[PDB]
Amino acid sequence: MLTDPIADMLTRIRNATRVYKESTDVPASRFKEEILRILAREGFIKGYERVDVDGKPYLRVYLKYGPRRQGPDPRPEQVIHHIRRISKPGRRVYVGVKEIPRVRRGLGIAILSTSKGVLTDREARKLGVGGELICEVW
Amino acid sequence: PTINQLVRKGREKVRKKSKVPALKGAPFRRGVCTVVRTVTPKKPNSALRKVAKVRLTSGYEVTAYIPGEGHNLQEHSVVLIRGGRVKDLPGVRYHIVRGVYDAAGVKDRKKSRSKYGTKKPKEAA
RNA sequence: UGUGGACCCGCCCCUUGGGGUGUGUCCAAAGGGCUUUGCCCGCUUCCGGAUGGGCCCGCGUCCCAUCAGCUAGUUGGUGGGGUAAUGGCCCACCAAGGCGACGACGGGUAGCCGGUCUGAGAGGAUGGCCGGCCACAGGGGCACUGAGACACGGGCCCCACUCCUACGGGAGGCAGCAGUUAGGAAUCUUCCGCAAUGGGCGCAAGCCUGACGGAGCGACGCCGCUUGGAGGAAGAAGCCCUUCGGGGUGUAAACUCCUGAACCCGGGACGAAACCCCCGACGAGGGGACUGACGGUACCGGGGUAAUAGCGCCGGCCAACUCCGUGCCAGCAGCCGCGGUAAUACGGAGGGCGCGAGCGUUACCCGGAUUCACUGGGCGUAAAGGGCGUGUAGGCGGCCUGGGGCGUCCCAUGUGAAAGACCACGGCUCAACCGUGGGGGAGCGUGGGAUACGCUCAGGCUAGACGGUGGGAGAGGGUGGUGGAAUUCCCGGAGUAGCGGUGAAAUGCGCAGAUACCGGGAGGAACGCCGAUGGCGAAGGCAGCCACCUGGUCCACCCGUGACGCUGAGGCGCGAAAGCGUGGGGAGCAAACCGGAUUAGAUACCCGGGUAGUCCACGCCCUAAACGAUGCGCGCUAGGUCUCUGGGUCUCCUGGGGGCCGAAGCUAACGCGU
RNA sequence: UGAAUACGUUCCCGGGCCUUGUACACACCGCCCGUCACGCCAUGGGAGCGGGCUCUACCCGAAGUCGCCGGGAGCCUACGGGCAGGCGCCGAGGGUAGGGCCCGUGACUGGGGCGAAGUCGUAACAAGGUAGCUGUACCGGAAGGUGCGGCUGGAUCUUUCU
């Protein structure tokens, strides 16, 4: 069936990037879309777009890396080095605005779902609202 | 273990226990000797290691070691026990405090003096 | 007498017994002093205020499931009793309930908190002193008085104990302060004072107060301070090394100057101004008087003496090394380890390191220990996957929309006592100690608000699951039946001196004619070749051939239902071999046992026999290297190659299995790697 | 002066390179297991005498509150009632009988841990000299041995001990 659609997505992304795929699908949900636009806006993915594959909605995610590196092993640096689910269906996680974590002296980000909607941590700090600590990236 | 598991079961405080039943905490206990013997040690060592059996005010009866280079202890001696094992004498898990009760300090003992219970000599004074 | 209040009844508001009103009933009182006709201290009834309590409810509050079922005032009701008041609190009667894996009942342990210690934190540990609550007052009940008690220094009875006793009967209760004794490793003075603060009674003067405020003892803790300061040899002696020149203790001492802890004399507190008196008015305000335990202490001024140092350690961890003594002795040791004639590890001396009125030791708590892992761990071989399934509760849940707003989030507000911690400023010469002020804070209550996620309700959808039709391989299971090979035995023919067995033998069997050979028959057990690196099953496991009964699974079409899903504590079922019960069967094999060998022996390995057992029926047993030593499901992440079984356009593609090599990655490595 | 013999490398001894297995590293003159014997230590079962908690049933039941009586049977009276006193329920505790549990002691007794050089063998580690481990079952001074089935976590195309 699938137990965590979001966590699965972060993974699909995680997995694709380490073999340096140019693209991945992930079956489509509006909540998935909302997370994607953050990655997109915050510079981790080139972007997503909707497609229908074998007749059903997916989101084609376009990944984004670094320049071919110098010595032995020229594999590019990852743009997404670390994407990680936090609030799993087993143990749901909620920070209030006072407890919103700052991922990696700011160089990171924490997608975080609120009643004002899906937000980065700074977005949500600024809007002054906590919620379900979704995951974190950097 | 899954979280649900931890929620159902929790973790468990290992709390391993005393190396010294000198009972009631008790930093020391008073005892009366029963038997003063001499013991062959073990593992890779050899010597005639001195040690007493002690009847305890805690109701116990334990073998305790007699430190110092020579001693004044015989059957009904009445003594104070301090704990601290020997190691080369298996089953000896307490020491006798020298210089308390009928256990004299050690004679002609100049260096580590507060242990061995030997008062400051005035010979250099 | 009734301002008023109580009670029945009626009505009104209000909503649990809250407020109001109306007939009826019922209920008050105490006097005392004077600066005696005007005040003071009191009395009575009522409404209210403040303070202190009783009771009830939500959440939180240790260990054992080797405690799994508990319950008769038990759970509820109706009516009474009782209380200030609710209530099975108690009683009568009616009903048959109530509680439990979200851990009841039972056992063990324990006063709880503010906080304290520790930790980066989360957490752990803890509850002494001070503050809050509780409970107890030799052990057990009980009530009386009263605003309040079921009362530490009030009462009654039973118990144990101690004293009095004319043996009939009495008295008592330091877990108040001291002190005694006992237990113990261990814990203080039978001190001074009510001067202050506070409490009781009193109009007041005052009286009482082991609350208290002080002194005493104990390095028990924290803080401050002292044992001197400046000079002073290429360096006294003594002791320690030494390669015999030298090196060290060492500016250390001796010695010269200087300051002057202790001690002497002088002076000398704050803490104490109220109650009280007088004036005013017994008010406000003003004036006056008394009073200090600590104490002739603190502090100030003068004089003045060079005036205490110990304990631990020096192999590594860990900072500090040489010489004698000793010879697995004596001894050391926190762990690793030192000692057997050159010991930086033992004992000693010199020296050195570390602390210093202390230094060590032992005990205990947190730490390090991400070594119970929430933050923050794991299980192929290291400890660790349940022998396998079925599915109970429980956990977890696909895509779209709308409602509710329980989780979650935000704002406001209330609470979070004091002390403590923290920051400032301040008061004792500093500090320890102390004071004043400030700052936060989870958690919970109240009002408002948000709706992404989780929850729930109402619809939808088809990608998960299930189903339909068509096709496939299979030692998957159960029942009956049948086939050929071989062994053993019986019968016959033929035939003769041995066979058998071993490393070699021997036991054994053979002239009652065995072995070898041909023919017939009986009986049991197992199925050669195909046979595979193969197939099936959830495991255990499953192998001639046939028939019937039956489980699972795979593919194609993309037809149906509409999330119906995954997992699964307990439960139940299955579970090799051995073993057990009852009853059969019994060829071959074979624990035990009986023999023969071998051997130093040989309860063994080799040989000859041989019972249980292996086979069947039924019922038990429930284990294993029950092994891939790898739990189930789902998504994702290069390929090559071998193979079993489907489908398709058939050199290849596309499913589902079985294998190997190997991308990324993983692993301590070996390895693992759709 | 002056031989004989060497096919051959299976065996004995010493050695060289590759590989394998290893529980050895003092390095096979290695390691190591169990009984028995000796000595310290803690512990388990244990009939009977003793010490307590607890449960049920039956009986006796102080103090006290409460309930009834309170009389021609006593004291007070304004005759309304009060007090003494009596009876009763409950009740601290106690007694009899029966189960469940803890504490101690406990003759006889099961093993276990540890201890510089005791005894018998040689199980295991190399194919450990019969590959080893294993569930079970029988047997034997001792390690063990055999039977049935399983596992690979086995190498390989005459004789013990240090």
Add this chain to the structure above:
RNA sequence: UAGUA
């Protein structure tokens, strides 16, 4: 046979 690389 015990300690001992």
Add this chain to the structure above:
RNA sequence: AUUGAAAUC
């Protein structure tokens, strides 16, 4: 005595 021992003369 041998080797530091245990054993052993």
